[PDB]
Structures are given as C-alpha cells and as structure tokens.
Short mmCIF file of C-alpha atoms and ligand atoms in Angstrom, two decimals:
data_model
loop_
_atom_site.label_atom_id
_atom_site.label_comp_id
_atom_site.label_asym_id
_atom_site.label_seq_id
_atom_site.Cartn_x
_atom_site.Cartn_y
_atom_site.Cartn_z
CA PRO A 1 -40.89 50.59 -65.53
CA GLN A 2 -37.21 51.76 -66.02
CA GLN A 3 -37.22 52.88 -62.40
CA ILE A 4 -37.48 49.21 -61.35
CA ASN A 5 -35.08 48.25 -64.08
CA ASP A 6 -32.29 50.70 -63.12
CA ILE A 7 -32.70 49.96 -59.44
CA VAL A 8 -32.57 46.10 -59.97
CA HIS A 9 -29.66 46.15 -62.38
CA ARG A 10 -27.71 48.65 -60.31
CA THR A 11 -27.92 46.43 -57.27
CA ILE A 12 -27.78 42.91 -58.62
CA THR A 13 -24.98 43.31 -61.23
CA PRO A 14 -22.24 44.04 -58.56
CA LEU A 15 -23.80 41.41 -56.26
CA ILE A 16 -23.30 38.64 -58.94
CA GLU A 17 -19.78 39.86 -59.62
CA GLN A 18 -18.69 40.27 -55.90
CA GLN A 19 -20.23 36.90 -54.85
CA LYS A 20 -19.34 34.99 -57.94
CA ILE A 21 -22.91 33.69 -58.39
CA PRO A 22 -23.33 31.35 -61.32
CA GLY A 23 -27.03 32.03 -61.89
CA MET A 24 -29.73 34.22 -60.43
CA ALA A 25 -33.37 34.97 -60.85
CA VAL A 26 -35.15 38.01 -59.26
CA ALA A 27 -38.78 39.02 -59.07
CA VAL A 28 -39.84 42.38 -57.92
CA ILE A 29 -43.59 42.63 -56.95
CA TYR A 30 -44.88 46.22 -57.32
CA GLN A 31 -48.45 47.50 -57.05
CA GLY A 32 -49.81 43.92 -57.71
CA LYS A 33 -47.69 42.98 -60.60
CA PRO A 34 -44.59 40.89 -61.09
CA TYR A 35 -41.26 41.99 -62.92
CA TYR A 36 -38.64 39.31 -63.70
CA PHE A 37 -34.99 39.41 -64.12
CA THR A 38 -32.50 36.57 -64.96
CA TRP A 39 -28.74 36.24 -65.19
CA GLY A 40 -26.07 33.49 -65.84
CA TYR A 41 -26.20 29.74 -65.82
CA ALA A 42 -28.54 27.18 -64.35
CA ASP A 43 -26.04 24.50 -65.34
CA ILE A 44 -22.48 25.58 -66.10
CA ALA A 45 -21.32 22.38 -67.80
CA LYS A 46 -24.24 22.06 -70.14
CA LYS A 47 -24.43 25.99 -70.72
CA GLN A 48 -28.15 26.08 -69.71
CA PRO A 49 -29.15 29.64 -68.79
CA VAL A 50 -31.34 30.73 -65.97
CA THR A 51 -34.88 31.34 -67.25
CA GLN A 52 -38.21 32.30 -65.68
CA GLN A 53 -38.89 28.52 -65.60
CA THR A 54 -35.60 27.40 -63.94
CA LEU A 55 -36.27 25.48 -60.62
CA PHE A 56 -34.06 26.54 -57.62
CA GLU A 57 -33.75 24.78 -54.25
CA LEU A 58 -35.49 27.11 -51.81
CA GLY A 59 -33.84 25.60 -48.78
CA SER A 60 -34.97 26.92 -45.56
CA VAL A 61 -37.47 29.35 -47.30
CA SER A 62 -39.45 26.13 -47.44
CA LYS A 63 -40.23 26.72 -43.67
CA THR A 64 -42.68 29.57 -44.86
CA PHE A 65 -44.62 26.91 -46.84
CA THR A 66 -44.62 24.66 -43.70
CA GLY A 67 -45.80 27.53 -41.47
CA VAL A 68 -48.66 28.37 -43.79
CA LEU A 69 -49.68 24.64 -44.12
CA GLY A 70 -49.81 24.48 -40.38
CA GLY A 71 -51.77 27.67 -40.22
CA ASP A 72 -54.24 26.12 -42.63
CA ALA A 73 -54.61 23.07 -40.39
CA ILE A 74 -55.30 25.33 -37.41
CA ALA A 75 -57.88 27.27 -39.47
CA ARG A 76 -59.47 23.86 -40.30
CA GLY A 77 -59.68 23.02 -36.66
CA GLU A 78 -57.54 19.95 -37.10
CA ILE A 79 -54.83 21.17 -34.72
CA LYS A 80 -54.21 23.87 -32.06
CA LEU A 81 -50.91 25.58 -31.35
CA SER A 82 -51.84 25.20 -27.68
CA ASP A 83 -51.90 21.32 -28.18
CA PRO A 84 -49.14 19.12 -26.30
CA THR A 85 -46.89 17.52 -28.89
CA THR A 86 -47.83 14.10 -27.22
CA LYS A 87 -51.39 14.63 -28.36
CA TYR A 88 -50.26 13.75 -31.92
CA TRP A 89 -47.34 11.55 -30.98
CA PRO A 90 -48.37 9.53 -27.85
CA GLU A 91 -45.32 7.28 -28.26
CA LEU A 92 -43.29 10.41 -27.15
CA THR A 93 -43.40 9.40 -23.47
CA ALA A 94 -40.14 10.85 -22.11
CA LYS A 95 -40.77 13.46 -19.35
CA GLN A 96 -38.98 16.37 -20.90
CA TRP A 97 -41.87 16.61 -23.39
CA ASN A 98 -44.35 17.63 -20.72
CA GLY A 99 -45.28 21.19 -21.40
CA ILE A 100 -43.89 21.34 -24.97
CA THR A 101 -46.71 22.36 -27.39
CA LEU A 102 -46.95 22.63 -31.12
CA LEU A 103 -46.35 26.39 -30.77
CA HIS A 104 -42.95 25.70 -29.25
CA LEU A 105 -42.00 23.36 -32.07
CA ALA A 106 -43.33 25.78 -34.83
CA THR A 107 -41.28 28.70 -33.36
CA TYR A 108 -38.04 27.16 -32.34
CA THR A 109 -38.81 27.67 -28.63
CA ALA A 110 -39.02 24.05 -27.33
CA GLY A 111 -35.84 24.40 -25.30
CA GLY A 112 -32.92 23.77 -27.67
CA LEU A 113 -33.93 21.22 -30.27
CA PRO A 114 -30.82 20.96 -32.59
CA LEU A 115 -30.34 22.84 -35.92
CA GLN A 116 -29.97 19.57 -37.78
CA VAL A 117 -31.50 16.16 -37.30
CA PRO A 118 -28.51 13.76 -37.05
CA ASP A 119 -27.52 11.99 -40.28
CA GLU A 120 -27.91 8.64 -38.65
CA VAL A 121 -31.65 9.25 -38.01
CA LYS A 122 -33.50 7.68 -40.98
CA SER A 123 -36.68 5.62 -40.09
CA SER A 124 -39.76 6.59 -38.08
CA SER A 125 -38.29 4.56 -35.16
CA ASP A 126 -34.96 6.30 -35.43
CA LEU A 127 -36.81 9.69 -35.21
CA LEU A 128 -38.80 8.58 -32.13
CA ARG A 129 -35.57 7.40 -30.47
CA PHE A 130 -33.92 10.69 -31.28
CA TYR A 131 -36.57 12.87 -29.67
CA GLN A 132 -37.03 10.51 -26.73
CA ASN A 133 -33.32 10.92 -25.90
CA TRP A 134 -33.06 14.57 -26.57
CA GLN A 135 -32.34 16.68 -23.46
CA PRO A 136 -33.46 20.33 -23.39
CA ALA A 137 -30.98 23.08 -22.29
CA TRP A 138 -33.78 25.44 -21.40
CA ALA A 139 -37.31 25.32 -20.26
CA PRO A 140 -40.04 25.59 -23.04
CA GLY A 141 -40.96 29.08 -24.18
CA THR A 142 -37.81 30.82 -22.84
CA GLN A 143 -35.17 30.56 -25.57
CA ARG A 144 -35.23 30.60 -29.41
CA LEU A 145 -32.71 28.34 -31.26
CA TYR A 146 -33.43 28.13 -35.08
CA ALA A 147 -33.79 24.48 -35.76
CA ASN A 148 -34.82 22.02 -38.63
CA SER A 149 -35.65 19.43 -35.97
CA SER A 150 -38.19 21.83 -34.33
CA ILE A 151 -40.36 23.12 -37.17
CA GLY A 152 -39.68 19.87 -39.10
CA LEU A 153 -41.42 17.96 -36.41
CA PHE A 154 -44.16 20.69 -36.23
CA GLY A 155 -44.90 20.13 -39.98
CA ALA A 156 -45.04 16.34 -39.67
CA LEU A 157 -47.37 16.42 -36.68
CA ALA A 158 -49.58 19.21 -38.12
CA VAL A 159 -50.80 17.14 -41.05
CA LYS A 160 -51.48 13.99 -39.01
CA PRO A 161 -55.26 14.61 -38.36
CA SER A 162 -55.68 15.17 -42.15
CA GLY A 163 -54.49 11.65 -42.75
CA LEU A 164 -52.52 12.90 -45.75
CA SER A 165 -48.75 12.68 -46.23
CA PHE A 166 -46.98 15.93 -45.83
CA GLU A 167 -46.25 16.25 -49.58
CA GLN A 168 -49.85 15.46 -50.46
CA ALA A 169 -51.24 18.00 -47.93
CA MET A 170 -48.82 20.67 -49.26
CA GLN A 171 -49.80 19.91 -52.83
CA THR A 172 -53.61 19.84 -52.22
CA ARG A 173 -53.89 22.63 -49.68
CA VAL A 174 -51.25 25.20 -50.62
CA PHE A 175 -49.59 24.67 -53.99
CA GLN A 176 -52.71 23.80 -56.07
CA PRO A 177 -55.01 26.63 -54.72
CA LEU A 178 -52.34 29.21 -55.33
CA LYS A 179 -51.63 27.91 -58.93
CA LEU A 180 -47.90 26.96 -57.91
CA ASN A 181 -47.93 24.38 -60.71
CA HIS A 182 -44.10 24.33 -60.94
CA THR A 183 -43.39 24.02 -57.22
CA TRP A 184 -42.22 20.64 -55.93
CA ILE A 185 -41.04 18.73 -52.84
CA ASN A 186 -39.88 15.99 -55.31
CA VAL A 187 -38.87 17.14 -58.80
CA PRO A 188 -40.59 14.83 -61.40
CA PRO A 189 -38.55 13.43 -64.25
CA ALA A 190 -40.54 15.60 -66.71
CA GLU A 191 -39.22 18.79 -64.97
CA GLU A 192 -35.59 17.78 -64.55
CA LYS A 193 -34.58 19.83 -67.64
CA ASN A 194 -35.46 22.94 -65.63
CA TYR A 195 -33.64 21.89 -62.45
CA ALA A 196 -30.64 24.08 -61.85
CA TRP A 197 -27.56 22.58 -60.25
CA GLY A 198 -26.37 24.21 -57.15
CA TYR A 199 -22.63 25.16 -56.77
CA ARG A 200 -20.54 24.52 -53.64
CA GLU A 201 -16.81 25.14 -53.80
CA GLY A 202 -17.32 24.89 -57.64
CA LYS A 203 -18.84 21.44 -57.62
CA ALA A 204 -22.34 20.84 -58.97
CA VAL A 205 -24.68 19.55 -56.22
CA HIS A 206 -28.20 18.95 -55.36
CA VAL A 207 -29.74 18.65 -51.97
CA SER A 208 -29.48 15.11 -50.42
CA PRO A 209 -32.24 13.26 -48.64
CA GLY A 210 -32.60 13.71 -44.98
CA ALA A 211 -35.17 13.20 -42.16
CA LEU A 212 -37.87 15.88 -42.19
CA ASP A 213 -36.24 17.36 -45.28
CA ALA A 214 -39.54 18.21 -47.00
CA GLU A 215 -40.76 20.02 -43.88
CA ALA A 216 -37.58 22.06 -43.13
CA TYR A 217 -35.77 22.72 -46.36
CA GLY A 218 -37.17 20.58 -49.24
CA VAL A 219 -39.07 22.73 -51.71
CA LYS A 220 -37.95 23.67 -55.22
CA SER A 221 -39.64 26.43 -57.22
CA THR A 222 -39.47 28.85 -60.21
CA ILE A 223 -39.14 32.51 -59.87
CA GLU A 224 -42.62 32.86 -61.35
CA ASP A 225 -44.28 30.62 -58.70
CA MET A 226 -42.25 32.48 -55.97
CA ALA A 227 -43.59 35.79 -57.17
CA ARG A 228 -47.07 34.24 -56.82
CA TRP A 229 -46.13 32.99 -53.30
CA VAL A 230 -45.11 36.60 -52.28
CA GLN A 231 -48.33 38.11 -53.74
CA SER A 232 -50.36 35.51 -51.85
CA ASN A 233 -48.77 36.43 -48.51
CA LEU A 234 -48.99 40.19 -49.31
CA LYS A 235 -52.71 40.18 -49.92
CA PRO A 236 -54.22 37.14 -48.28
CA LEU A 237 -57.81 38.47 -48.60
CA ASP A 238 -57.62 37.87 -52.31
CA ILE A 239 -57.39 34.14 -51.72
CA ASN A 240 -60.74 32.44 -52.09
CA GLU A 241 -60.01 29.33 -50.03
CA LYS A 242 -61.03 30.45 -46.50
CA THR A 243 -58.74 28.30 -44.37
CA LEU A 244 -55.71 29.04 -46.58
CA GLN A 245 -56.40 32.80 -46.31
CA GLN A 246 -56.73 32.27 -42.66
CA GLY A 247 -53.59 30.17 -42.36
CA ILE A 248 -51.48 32.82 -44.24
CA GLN A 249 -52.60 35.39 -41.66
CA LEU A 250 -51.75 33.03 -38.79
CA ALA A 251 -48.20 32.49 -40.11
CA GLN A 252 -47.57 36.32 -40.00
CA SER A 253 -48.91 36.62 -36.35
CA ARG A 254 -46.28 37.76 -33.86
CA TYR A 255 -45.72 35.02 -31.26
CA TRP A 256 -42.40 35.92 -29.75
CA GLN A 257 -39.93 38.85 -29.74
CA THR A 258 -36.06 38.75 -29.70
CA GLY A 259 -34.28 42.09 -30.27
CA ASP A 260 -36.30 43.78 -32.82
CA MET A 261 -37.57 40.71 -34.57
CA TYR A 262 -40.84 38.77 -34.23
CA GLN A 263 -41.28 35.09 -34.89
CA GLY A 264 -44.18 33.85 -36.94
CA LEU A 265 -44.85 30.43 -38.42
CA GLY A 266 -41.90 30.18 -40.84
CA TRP A 267 -41.96 33.91 -41.59
CA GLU A 268 -40.05 36.38 -39.47
CA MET A 269 -41.18 39.97 -39.14
CA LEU A 270 -40.06 43.43 -38.10
CA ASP A 271 -41.86 46.69 -37.76
CA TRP A 272 -41.68 48.88 -40.98
CA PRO A 273 -39.66 51.16 -41.26
CA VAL A 274 -36.77 48.92 -40.37
CA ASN A 275 -33.42 49.89 -39.51
CA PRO A 276 -31.43 48.40 -42.43
CA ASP A 277 -28.44 47.59 -40.27
CA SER A 278 -30.64 45.54 -37.98
CA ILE A 279 -32.06 43.31 -40.64
CA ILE A 280 -28.73 43.07 -42.58
CA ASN A 281 -26.56 42.32 -39.63
CA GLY A 282 -29.35 40.19 -38.01
CA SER A 283 -29.35 37.93 -41.04
CA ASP A 284 -25.78 36.84 -40.52
CA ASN A 285 -25.86 33.13 -39.24
CA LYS A 286 -23.79 34.44 -36.15
CA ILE A 287 -27.01 36.12 -35.05
CA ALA A 288 -29.65 34.17 -36.98
CA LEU A 289 -28.55 30.57 -35.67
CA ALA A 290 -27.55 31.79 -32.17
CA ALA A 291 -29.60 30.89 -29.05
CA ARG A 292 -31.42 33.95 -27.78
CA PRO A 293 -34.00 34.67 -24.99
CA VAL A 294 -37.51 35.48 -26.17
CA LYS A 295 -40.28 37.45 -24.72
CA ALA A 296 -43.84 35.93 -25.23
CA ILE A 297 -46.41 38.13 -27.06
CA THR A 298 -49.45 37.32 -24.86
CA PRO A 299 -51.62 36.98 -26.91
CA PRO A 300 -49.91 37.07 -30.25
CA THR A 301 -50.41 40.19 -32.39
CA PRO A 302 -52.39 39.45 -35.65
CA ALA A 303 -50.51 40.12 -38.90
CA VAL A 304 -49.21 43.75 -38.89
CA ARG A 305 -49.53 45.36 -42.33
CA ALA A 306 -46.67 47.82 -41.46
CA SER A 307 -44.04 45.10 -41.39
CA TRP A 308 -41.05 43.94 -43.09
CA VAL A 309 -41.73 40.23 -43.53
CA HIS A 310 -38.92 37.91 -44.78
CA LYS A 311 -37.04 34.66 -44.78
CA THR A 312 -33.59 33.66 -45.87
CA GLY A 313 -32.99 30.08 -47.17
CA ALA A 314 -30.01 27.87 -48.08
CA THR A 315 -29.02 24.38 -49.10
CA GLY A 316 -25.41 23.26 -49.73
CA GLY A 317 -25.61 24.58 -53.29
CA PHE A 318 -28.31 27.37 -53.27
CA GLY A 319 -29.20 30.71 -51.56
CA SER A 320 -32.60 32.30 -51.46
CA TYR A 321 -34.27 35.26 -50.06
CA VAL A 322 -37.89 36.56 -49.87
CA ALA A 323 -39.10 39.77 -48.32
CA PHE A 324 -42.21 41.94 -48.65
CA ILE A 325 -43.97 44.84 -46.99
CA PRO A 326 -47.77 44.43 -46.92
CA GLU A 327 -48.45 48.20 -46.23
CA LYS A 328 -46.74 49.03 -49.50
CA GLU A 329 -47.91 46.17 -51.72
CA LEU A 330 -44.25 45.63 -52.35
CA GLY A 331 -42.08 42.42 -52.42
CA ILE A 332 -38.91 40.70 -53.74
CA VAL A 333 -37.71 37.22 -54.46
CA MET A 334 -33.92 36.46 -55.01
CA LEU A 335 -33.03 32.84 -56.10
CA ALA A 336 -29.40 31.84 -56.69
CA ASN A 337 -27.54 28.65 -57.18
CA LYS A 338 -24.79 29.52 -54.72
CA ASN A 339 -25.09 29.74 -50.94
CA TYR A 340 -23.60 33.18 -50.62
CA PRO A 341 -23.75 35.27 -47.41
CA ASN A 342 -27.11 36.25 -45.96
CA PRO A 343 -26.14 39.96 -45.30
CA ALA A 344 -25.41 40.55 -48.97
CA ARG A 345 -28.90 39.22 -49.80
CA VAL A 346 -30.67 41.46 -47.37
CA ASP A 347 -28.60 44.48 -48.28
CA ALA A 348 -29.44 44.18 -51.90
CA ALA A 349 -33.21 43.73 -51.23
CA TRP A 350 -33.39 46.55 -48.87
CA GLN A 351 -31.75 48.84 -51.42
CA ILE A 352 -34.22 47.78 -54.10
CA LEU A 353 -37.35 47.93 -51.94
CA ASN A 354 -36.45 51.22 -50.10
CA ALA A 355 -35.94 52.75 -53.52
CA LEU A 356 -39.38 51.76 -54.74
CA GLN A 357 -41.46 52.53 -51.67
O1 LIG B 401 -28.74 19.69 -46.24
C1 LIG B 401 -28.51 20.74 -46.98
O2 LIG B 401 -27.77 20.78 -47.95
C2 LIG B 401 -28.96 22.13 -46.65
C3 LIG B 401 -30.43 22.19 -45.99
N1 LIG B 401 -30.45 23.47 -45.40
C4 LIG B 401 -30.43 23.67 -44.11
O3 LIG B 401 -30.46 22.78 -43.29
C5 LIG B 401 -30.35 25.19 -43.66
C6 LIG B 401 -29.12 25.76 -44.32
C7 LIG B 401 -28.02 26.04 -43.21
C8 LIG B 401 -27.95 24.74 -42.39
C9 LIG B 401 -29.18 24.73 -41.56
C10 LIG B 401 -30.05 25.78 -42.27
C11 LIG B 401 -29.08 26.79 -42.53
C12 LIG B 401 -28.71 27.96 -41.57
C13 LIG B 401 -29.41 28.31 -42.94
O4 LIG B 401 -28.19 23.24 -46.08
C14 LIG B 401 -26.89 23.17 -45.90
C15 LIG B 401 -26.07 22.07 -45.37
C16 LIG B 401 -24.72 22.29 -45.22
C17 LIG B 401 -24.20 23.47 -45.52
C18 LIG B 401 -24.93 24.54 -45.94
C19 LIG B 401 -26.29 24.39 -46.17
#
C-alpha cells in the first residue's frame, strides 16, 4: 500500500543521508503481512547491493532470541527463573553468588555484572575464574546494569539440562520451528556470498569471536527471517510448538520496572501509547547502559498486548532495531551495516508505526 510506501520512504531516505549508512533493509509488518524495502550496499568494494537475502549482524538484538530460548526451557520444565545460579554451575562457590538467581542473570539485576566479558577470558576455566573473582557493587535484585556477561551466562546455563550446545538448542528449538532458515550463529561457507560487511570509521569489519558471543550478540539474519521473528512475537498463539509459544510469552512478561520501561527476557517493553521522547531519549546509551534502580514486579505481569516491545542491537560495524505493538498487529525491523546512534533508529521507527496505527 502506497501509505506504507510513502511513510517508509519519507522517513528512511533522510535517515540514510544524515547517518551516511552504506546499506539498509527494512520490513514493516502490517495486519499480518510483511513489506520489504532495501537501499545501498552490502559490500561497498565489490558493489554488492542490499537484497532481501542479505545477512546482517543483529548484535544485541540477539538477546531476544536468547530470552525466548530461555523461556522455552522454562516452559519445558528444564529450568526455573527462581533457581540459584549454582544449581547449574556448582563450581561457582564464591560467596557473592548466594542469592543470585537465573532471573537476576536474565534481566541484568545480579548486582553489577560488567557490560563486556574481558577480552582475556577465553576458556571455560577462564570464565569460571572471572565470575568467581567478580565483586558485586549492589545486592541482587536492586539495580539494573545492561550486560553481556549477565544474560550471556543466563543463556549458557539455560541450555545445560537439555545437554545440547547453545547453538544446537537455538537451531532445533527456535530457528527451525519458526522457519528461520537463513538465520545463523555461525555463517556457513555456502551463505558467505550474502553476508554484508559492517562499516566502522569506513573500514569493512565483521564481529570478532568473544566469550558468550553467541548468547549476547552473535546472531546474523536476513530481513525476511527478521520479519518472521517479529510476527512470531506479535502473535505467539499462532505457533504450534507449545513450549515455544509459552516461551515467547514469558520473554514479554514484565519482571522489573525502571522509569517507564519494563524488563523482559531480552525484550524491553513500555505501555502503549508511549511518549516518543521517552523511548527515543531512553534508547541513547547514556541512559540504556547506565546503572539504574529497579522495582520488582511481584509477581511479573504476563505479556501485555497494549505494549511497545522493542530492542536495539549493535556490533562494531552494524546497527539494528526491532519494535512491535501486539495490540495493533504492527511491527518494524531496521537492519543497517553501520552502528549509527540509537535515538535516530527509534525516532524513525516511531514515525513509521505511529503513522500506520
Ligand atoms: O564485539 C562487538 O563488535 C560488538 C558486540 N556488541 C555488543 O557488545 C553490544 C554493542 C555495544 C557494546 C555492548 C553492547 C552495546 C551497547 C549496545 O559491539 C561493539 C563493540 C565495540 C563498539 C561497538 C559495538
């Protein structure tokens, strides 16, 4: 519909110009159907255009897959958010871990686990040593500090009862049921032709390996698969696998509140209608990566349909954004191979979705 076309082109054209974005793909999900848009270059040097089959690094949008996979493990009865972390990692004997649950890890509330795992932390024994030596700044369940080392550990522990690797669990329990057949934690050689380069300060870059990278920022996907991901989270009851349907719902439950935002598993939520300044200004890393006190939602509120549900994501060379409103059957995916500022992403998305609702 030309409505959607005009709204998308009027918003995204100046965005690409202002932010000097080499390549971009957008999907609008409207009344149960996807509409796709593409611009510019997946590979500047080889003049490869962005297409609907181009793979982008999702970066920290990957945490929404980790949260849903954890939700599925809960639904299967393999894990409980109320479980002690030591239940699944008994070698974690240092006393500061008493009272830190899987809920705390999944929601960044364990007491100040760091944003990044240190570069020097490679092996399973390096990781154990790192968490054993870590000293919390706050008591558990009092402060939120967005952190790869928190939900990354949640994801690694959540798959342990299944006996599967994190990648294998993700493939079998999330990607394959939802027909995300071009979504990868490790891009296979046969798919490299579609893997866009990211651009950082003009240099072509791909994400480098890191501990817990798959769990915190490691998924790559196409605009078509990401539209399917949005539709799956918009309407979980259409999903025929029972524990996956349940796990999607659990990831949109409201566990903590800070300001006007609610923390789910990976996803973040606000009541719809939102104040746009709240979500735009709130997506700035100055707010999004800051330590903030949280109020427990006791017990957590089940997924609220009248919500703005969203997640920003980045790697060194890529910037992504996903947002949807279940009440309105409406969503958007924006995938770019430049890590450009979060408020510009959310501003564009709110202009498009507000116009269409
Ligand atoms: O290793 C990487 O290339 C990735 C992996 N992405 C993350 O870790 C996330 C992205 C940034 C950093 C923490 C999370 C974030 C606040 C949104 O991102 C980087 C690293 C260096 C510079 C910019 C991005």
